[PDB]
PDB file of all heavy atoms in Angstrom:
ATOM      1  N   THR A  34      66.104 -80.837   2.006  1.00 49.97           N
ATOM      2  CA  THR A  34      67.065 -79.831   1.555  1.00 49.97           C
ATOM      3  C   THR A  34      67.501 -80.157   0.146  1.00 49.97           C
ATOM      4  O   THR A  34      67.410 -81.311  -0.284  1.00 49.97           O
ATOM      5  CB  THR A  34      68.293 -79.782   2.480  1.00 49.97           C
ATOM      6  OG1 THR A  34      69.174 -78.779   2.010  1.00 49.97           O
ATOM      7  CG2 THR A  34      69.053 -81.142   2.507  1.00 49.97           C
ATOM      8  N   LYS A  35      68.012 -79.164  -0.545  1.00 47.89           N
ATOM      9  CA  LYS A  35      68.650 -79.335  -1.855  1.00 47.89           C
ATOM     10  C   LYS A  35      70.179 -79.557  -1.746  1.00 47.89           C
ATOM     11  O   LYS A  35      70.880 -79.810  -2.708  1.00 47.89           O
ATOM     12  CB  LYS A  35      68.312 -78.219  -2.826  1.00 47.89           C
ATOM     13  CG  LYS A  35      66.816 -78.265  -3.252  1.00 47.89           C
ATOM     14  CD  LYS A  35      66.486 -77.319  -4.300  1.00 47.89           C
ATOM     15  CE  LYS A  35      65.024 -77.382  -4.728  1.00 47.89           C
ATOM     16  NZ  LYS A  35      64.631 -76.397  -5.730  1.00 47.89           N
ATOM     17  N   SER A  36      70.661 -79.497  -0.481  1.00 48.46           N
ATOM     18  CA  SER A  36      72.104 -79.711  -0.194  1.00 48.46           C
ATOM     19  C   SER A  36      72.497 -81.123  -0.464  1.00 48.46           C
ATOM     20  O   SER A  36      71.773 -82.052  -0.127  1.00 48.46           O
ATOM     21  CB  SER A  36      72.424 -79.315   1.250  1.00 48.46           C
ATOM     22  OG  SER A  36      73.747 -79.732   1.586  1.00 48.46           O
ATOM     23  N   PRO A  37      73.661 -81.344  -1.067  1.00 48.52           N
ATOM     24  CA  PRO A  37      74.182 -82.719  -1.266  1.00 48.52           C
ATOM     25  C   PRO A  37      74.776 -83.264   0.046  1.00 48.52           C
ATOM     26  O   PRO A  37      75.174 -84.458   0.065  1.00 48.52           O
ATOM     27  CB  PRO A  37      75.240 -82.565  -2.311  1.00 48.52           C
ATOM     28  CG  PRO A  37      75.784 -81.188  -2.106  1.00 48.52           C
ATOM     29  CD  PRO A  37      74.597 -80.363  -1.672  1.00 48.52           C
ATOM     30  N   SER A  38      74.790 -82.506   1.174  1.00 51.23           N
ATOM     31  CA  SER A  38      75.287 -83.005   2.402  1.00 51.23           C
ATOM     32  C   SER A  38      74.199 -83.683   3.221  1.00 51.23           C
ATOM     33  O   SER A  38      73.255 -83.104   3.669  1.00 51.23           O
ATOM     34  CB  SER A  38      75.931 -81.848   3.262  1.00 51.23           C
ATOM     35  OG  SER A  38      76.456 -82.353   4.481  1.00 51.23           O
ATOM     36  N   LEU A  39      74.419 -85.014   3.426  1.00 48.61           N
ATOM     37  CA  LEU A  39      73.497 -85.800   4.179  1.00 48.61           C
ATOM     38  C   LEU A  39      73.329 -85.309   5.630  1.00 48.61           C
ATOM     39  O   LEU A  39      72.245 -85.378   6.190  1.00 48.61           O
ATOM     40  CB  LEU A  39      73.865 -87.316   4.166  1.00 48.61           C
ATOM     41  CG  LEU A  39      73.022 -88.284   4.973  1.00 48.61           C
ATOM     42  CD1 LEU A  39      71.530 -88.288   4.492  1.00 48.61           C
ATOM     43  CD2 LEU A  39      73.627 -89.701   4.933  1.00 48.61           C
ATOM     44  N   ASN A  40      74.375 -84.739   6.193  1.00 49.30           N
ATOM     45  CA  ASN A  40      74.288 -84.151   7.571  1.00 49.30           C
ATOM     46  C   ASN A  40      73.363 -82.929   7.600  1.00 49.30           C
ATOM     47  O   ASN A  40      72.728 -82.706   8.594  1.00 49.30           O
ATOM     48  CB  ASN A  40      75.672 -83.862   8.103  1.00 49.30           C
ATOM     49  CG  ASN A  40      76.436 -85.135   8.487  1.00 49.30           C
ATOM     50  OD1 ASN A  40      75.919 -86.058   9.042  1.00 49.30           O
ATOM     51  ND2 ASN A  40      77.750 -85.127   8.105  1.00 49.30           N
ATOM     52  N   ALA A  41      73.386 -82.127   6.542  1.00 48.51           N
ATOM     53  CA  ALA A  41      72.474 -80.976   6.478  1.00 48.51           C
ATOM     54  C   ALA A  41      71.020 -81.482   6.409  1.00 48.51           C
ATOM     55  O   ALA A  41      70.135 -80.883   7.061  1.00 48.51           O
ATOM     56  CB  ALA A  41      72.799 -80.072   5.239  1.00 48.51           C
ATOM     57  N   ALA A  42      70.801 -82.570   5.616  1.00 47.19           N
ATOM     58  CA  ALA A  42      69.428 -83.187   5.572  1.00 47.19           C
ATOM     59  C   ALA A  42      68.981 -83.702   6.959  1.00 47.19           C
ATOM     60  O   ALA A  42      67.876 -83.506   7.312  1.00 47.19           O
ATOM     61  CB  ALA A  42      69.414 -84.303   4.524  1.00 47.19           C
ATOM     62  N   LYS A  43      69.906 -84.376   7.644  1.00 49.60           N
ATOM     63  CA  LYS A  43      69.584 -84.883   8.989  1.00 49.60           C
ATOM     64  C   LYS A  43      69.293 -83.756   9.969  1.00 49.60           C
ATOM     65  O   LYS A  43      68.400 -83.880  10.818  1.00 49.60           O
ATOM     66  CB  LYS A  43      70.782 -85.750   9.481  1.00 49.60           C
ATOM     67  CG  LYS A  43      70.813 -87.121   8.804  1.00 49.60           C
ATOM     68  CD  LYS A  43      72.111 -87.869   9.202  1.00 49.60           C
ATOM     69  CE  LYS A  43      72.008 -89.314   8.777  1.00 49.60           C
ATOM     70  NZ  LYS A  43      73.305 -89.976   9.000  1.00 49.60           N
ATOM     71  N   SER A  44      70.032 -82.635   9.863  1.00 44.82           N
ATOM     72  CA  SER A  44      69.730 -81.455  10.701  1.00 44.82           C
ATOM     73  C   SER A  44      68.316 -80.944  10.399  1.00 44.82           C
ATOM     74  O   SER A  44      67.589 -80.645  11.325  1.00 44.82           O
ATOM     75  CB  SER A  44      70.761 -80.381  10.496  1.00 44.82           C
ATOM     76  OG  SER A  44      70.669 -79.370  11.448  1.00 44.82           O
ATOM     77  N   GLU A  45      67.974 -80.842   9.142  1.00 48.45           N
ATOM     78  CA  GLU A  45      66.699 -80.340   8.748  1.00 48.45           C
ATOM     79  C   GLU A  45      65.602 -81.306   9.228  1.00 48.45           C
ATOM     80  O   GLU A  45      64.549 -80.840   9.703  1.00 48.45           O
ATOM     81  CB  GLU A  45      66.554 -80.140   7.263  1.00 48.45           C
ATOM     82  CG  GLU A  45      67.328 -78.921   6.762  1.00 48.45           C
ATOM     83  CD  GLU A  45      66.984 -77.628   7.429  1.00 48.45           C
ATOM     84  OE1 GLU A  45      65.787 -77.266   7.336  1.00 48.45           O
ATOM     85  OE2 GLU A  45      67.857 -76.991   8.045  1.00 48.45           O
ATOM     86  N   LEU A  46      65.833 -82.589   9.167  1.00 46.69           N
ATOM     87  CA  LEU A  46      64.906 -83.593   9.651  1.00 46.69           C
ATOM     88  C   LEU A  46      64.610 -83.407  11.136  1.00 46.69           C
ATOM     89  O   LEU A  46      63.472 -83.398  11.592  1.00 46.69           O
ATOM     90  CB  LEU A  46      65.401 -85.044   9.357  1.00 46.69           C
ATOM     91  CG  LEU A  46      64.489 -86.113   9.831  1.00 46.69           C
ATOM     92  CD1 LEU A  46      63.092 -86.041   9.229  1.00 46.69           C
ATOM     93  CD2 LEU A  46      65.114 -87.499   9.575  1.00 46.69           C
ATOM     94  N   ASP A  47      65.693 -83.389  11.897  1.00 48.87           N
ATOM     95  CA  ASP A  47      65.570 -83.225  13.370  1.00 48.87           C
ATOM     96  C   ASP A  47      64.817 -81.938  13.754  1.00 48.87           C
ATOM     97  O   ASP A  47      64.017 -82.019  14.715  1.00 48.87           O
ATOM     98  CB  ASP A  47      66.952 -83.269  14.048  1.00 48.87           C
ATOM     99  CG  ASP A  47      67.651 -84.582  13.887  1.00 48.87           C
ATOM    100  OD1 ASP A  47      67.018 -85.580  13.392  1.00 48.87           O
ATOM    101  OD2 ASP A  47      68.837 -84.682  14.273  1.00 48.87           O
ATOM    102  N   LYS A  48      65.074 -80.885  13.034  1.00 46.62           N
ATOM    103  CA  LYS A  48      64.375 -79.602  13.249  1.00 46.62           C
ATOM    104  C   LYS A  48      62.909 -79.743  12.910  1.00 46.62           C
ATOM    105  O   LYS A  48      62.053 -79.187  13.591  1.00 46.62           O
ATOM    106  CB  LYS A  48      65.060 -78.541  12.433  1.00 46.62           C
ATOM    107  CG  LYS A  48      64.382 -77.171  12.428  1.00 46.62           C
ATOM    108  CD  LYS A  48      65.320 -76.075  11.963  1.00 46.62           C
ATOM    109  CE  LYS A  48      65.791 -76.299  10.517  1.00 46.62           C
ATOM    110  NZ  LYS A  48      64.833 -75.806   9.548  1.00 46.62           N
ATOM    111  N   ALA A  49      62.570 -80.480  11.833  1.00 47.51           N
ATOM    112  CA  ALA A  49      61.165 -80.605  11.394  1.00 47.51           C
ATOM    113  C   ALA A  49      60.380 -81.483  12.329  1.00 47.51           C
ATOM    114  O   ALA A  49      59.159 -81.197  12.578  1.00 47.51           O
ATOM    115  CB  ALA A  49      61.166 -81.202  10.006  1.00 47.51           C
ATOM    116  N   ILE A  50      60.988 -82.526  12.933  1.00 47.10           N
ATOM    117  CA  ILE A  50      60.336 -83.478  13.819  1.00 47.10           C
ATOM    118  C   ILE A  50      60.379 -83.079  15.272  1.00 47.10           C
ATOM    119  O   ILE A  50      59.494 -83.423  16.052  1.00 47.10           O
ATOM    120  CB  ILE A  50      60.918 -84.898  13.601  1.00 47.10           C
ATOM    121  CG1 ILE A  50      60.794 -85.305  12.126  1.00 47.10           C
ATOM    122  CG2 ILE A  50      60.229 -85.918  14.524  1.00 47.10           C
ATOM    123  CD1 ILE A  50      59.382 -85.448  11.586  1.00 47.10           C
ATOM    124  N   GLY A  51      61.443 -82.338  15.669  1.00 46.76           N
ATOM    125  CA  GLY A  51      61.605 -81.911  17.057  1.00 46.76           C
ATOM    126  C   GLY A  51      62.299 -82.884  17.948  1.00 46.76           C
ATOM    127  O   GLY A  51      62.102 -82.904  19.191  1.00 46.76           O
ATOM    128  N   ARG A  52      63.023 -83.839  17.364  1.00 48.62           N
ATOM    129  CA  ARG A  52      63.810 -84.767  18.108  1.00 48.62           C
ATOM    130  C   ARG A  52      65.019 -85.261  17.273  1.00 48.62           C
ATOM    131  O   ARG A  52      65.004 -84.993  16.039  1.00 48.62           O
ATOM    132  CB  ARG A  52      63.024 -85.981  18.554  1.00 48.62           C
ATOM    133  CG  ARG A  52      62.503 -86.834  17.378  1.00 48.62           C
ATOM    134  CD  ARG A  52      61.670 -88.011  17.865  1.00 48.62           C
ATOM    135  NE  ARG A  52      61.230 -88.816  16.702  1.00 48.62           N
ATOM    136  CZ  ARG A  52      61.983 -89.825  16.182  1.00 48.62           C
ATOM    137  NH1 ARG A  52      63.171 -90.146  16.702  1.00 48.62           N
ATOM    138  NH2 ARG A  52      61.527 -90.469  15.110  1.00 48.62           N
ATOM    139  N   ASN A  53      65.977 -85.915  17.819  1.00 48.94           N
ATOM    140  CA  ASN A  53      67.057 -86.495  17.059  1.00 48.94           C
ATOM    141  C   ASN A  53      66.634 -87.789  16.462  1.00 48.94           C
ATOM    142  O   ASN A  53      66.482 -88.762  17.162  1.00 48.94           O
ATOM    143  CB  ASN A  53      68.291 -86.689  17.999  1.00 48.94           C
ATOM    144  CG  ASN A  53      69.239 -85.451  17.966  1.00 48.94           C
ATOM    145  OD1 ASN A  53      68.764 -84.293  18.121  1.00 48.94           O
ATOM    146  ND2 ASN A  53      70.524 -85.702  17.757  1.00 48.94           N
ATOM    147  N   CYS A  54      66.466 -87.782  15.133  1.00 49.51           N
ATOM    148  CA  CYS A  54      65.836 -88.871  14.424  1.00 49.51           C
ATOM    149  C   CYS A  54      66.864 -89.853  13.857  1.00 49.51           C
ATOM    150  O   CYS A  54      66.454 -91.029  13.534  1.00 49.51           O
ATOM    151  CB  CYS A  54      64.990 -88.389  13.247  1.00 49.51           C
ATOM    152  SG  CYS A  54      63.615 -87.349  13.758  1.00 49.51           S
ATOM    153  N   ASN A  55      68.103 -89.428  13.701  1.00 49.82           N
ATOM    154  CA  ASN A  55      69.114 -90.197  12.969  1.00 49.82           C
ATOM    155  C   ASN A  55      68.619 -90.765  11.666  1.00 49.82           C
ATOM    156  O   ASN A  55      68.837 -91.983  11.364  1.00 49.82           O
ATOM    157  CB  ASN A  55      69.738 -91.225  13.888  1.00 49.82           C
ATOM    158  CG  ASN A  55      71.082 -91.740  13.354  1.00 49.82           C
ATOM    159  OD1 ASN A  55      71.895 -90.979  12.852  1.00 49.82           O
ATOM    160  ND2 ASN A  55      71.377 -93.000  13.553  1.00 49.82           N
ATOM    161  N   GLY A  56      67.928 -89.924  10.900  1.00 45.56           N
ATOM    162  CA  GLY A  56      67.557 -90.267   9.530  1.00 45.56           C
ATOM    163  C   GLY A  56      66.333 -91.129   9.370  1.00 45.56           C
ATOM    164  O   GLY A  56      66.061 -91.624   8.249  1.00 45.56           O
ATOM    165  N   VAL A  57      65.599 -91.377  10.434  1.00 47.16           N
ATOM    166  CA  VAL A  57      64.450 -92.293  10.400  1.00 47.16           C
ATOM    167  C   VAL A  57      63.292 -91.712  11.226  1.00 47.16           C
ATOM    168  O   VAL A  57      63.504 -91.188  12.298  1.00 47.16           O
ATOM    169  CB  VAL A  57      64.813 -93.719  10.960  1.00 47.16           C
ATOM    170  CG1 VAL A  57      63.657 -94.667  10.852  1.00 47.16           C
ATOM    171  CG2 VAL A  57      66.006 -94.259  10.257  1.00 47.16           C
TER     172      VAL A  57
END
Side-chain angles (χ1 to χ4, degrees):
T34 181
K35 293 186 177 179
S36 171
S38 181
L39 179 59
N40 289 316
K43 287 173 168 173
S44 189
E45 289 304 302
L46 179 59
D47 294 351
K48 177 162 59 82
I50 304 295
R52 65 179 182 88
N53 270 50
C54 297
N55 197 36
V57 183

